[PDB]
Design a protein around this ligand. Structure first.
Ligand SMILES: O=C(N[C@@H](c1ccccc1O)P(=O)(O)O)c1scc2c1CCCC2
Ligand SMILES: [Mg+2]
Ligand SMILES: [Zn+2]
Ligand SMILES: [Zn+2]
Length: 231
């Protein structure tokens, strides 16, 4: 049902409808001779769409916009990037050229600039302290604390009970840590517990990469992070 790497030729994007007015977008990138999938989210708001995260690169993100137009046919008016790495902001210049207003926390914008990555235009206030949440159109944005990165956000869609964890939440099939170069391993389990406490009613949990599941992805991620901590 949910698409996997082998179904998606590089440069193509698939959409997967999770619930009424909520999709994930799935793309792939090649790095170091392997192929990686990546997810983001699309949430309908009235007659417009909110996009969560790029499709990891300019060409993928242009394909994402073309697929949205072909399959959904509503304008993407705003986009949020959930942390500063290229799988989240790579493609922001494509979004901007297409007239999408791009957003990230000020912490994410700063880190993206230091990294030489693309920088979303607008700064999301009210997300600087662990446990902070703000409404943004049809979603709640939540800063759980440092985890995969110090700036990582998660996104909850209340009407659909969909929680998008981004790269702070791992799919079940991943049993070792990813790239954790910018992670706060010490705080990651506490940040995951904040997500659990704030969204205990979540019915669908979307990781940054790979297959959706339920809230079980949170404790799975904590297990992987603690095992890596003790490596
Ligand atoms: O987008 C990035 N990495 C994502 C990623 C996706 C699939 C497989 C591996 C992987 O690292 P992720 O770690 O954000 O999930 C990039 S690009 C340049 C860097 C990074 C991460 C930190 C070091 C410098
Ligand atoms: Mg941000
Ligand atoms: Zn990352
Ligand atoms: Zn990632």
């Amino acid at each position: 049902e949910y698409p996997t790497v082998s179904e998606i030729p590089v440069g193509e994007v698939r959409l997967y409808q999770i619930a009424d007015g909520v999709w994930s977008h799935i793309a792939t990138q090649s790095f170091d001779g392997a192929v990686y999938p990546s997810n983001g989210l699309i949430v309908r708001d009235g007659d417009e769409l909110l996009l969560i995260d790029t499709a990891w690169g300019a060409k993928n993100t242009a394909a994402l916009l073309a697929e949205i137009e072909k399959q959904i046919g509503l304008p993407v008016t705003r986009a949020v990037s959930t942390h500063f790495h290229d799988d989240r902001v790579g493609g922001v210049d494509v979004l901007r050229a297409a007239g999408v207003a791009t957003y990230a926390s000020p912490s994410t914008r700063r880190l993206a600039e230091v990294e030489g990555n693309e920088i979303p235009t607008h700064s999301l206030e009210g997300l600087s302290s662990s446990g902070d949440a703000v409404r943004f159109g049809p979603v709640e944005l939540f800063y759980p604390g440092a985890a995969h990165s110090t700036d990582n956000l998660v996104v909850y869609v209340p009407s659909a009970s969909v929680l998008y964890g981004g790269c702070a939440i791992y799919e079940l099939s991943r049993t070792s840590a990813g790239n954790v170069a910018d992670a706060d391993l010490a705080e990651w389990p506490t940040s995951i517990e904040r997500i659990q406490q704030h969204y205990p009613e979540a019915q669908f949990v979307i990781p940054g990469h790979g297959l959706p599941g339920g809230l079980d992805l949170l404790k799975h991620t904590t297990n992987v992070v603690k095992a890596h901590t003790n490596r």
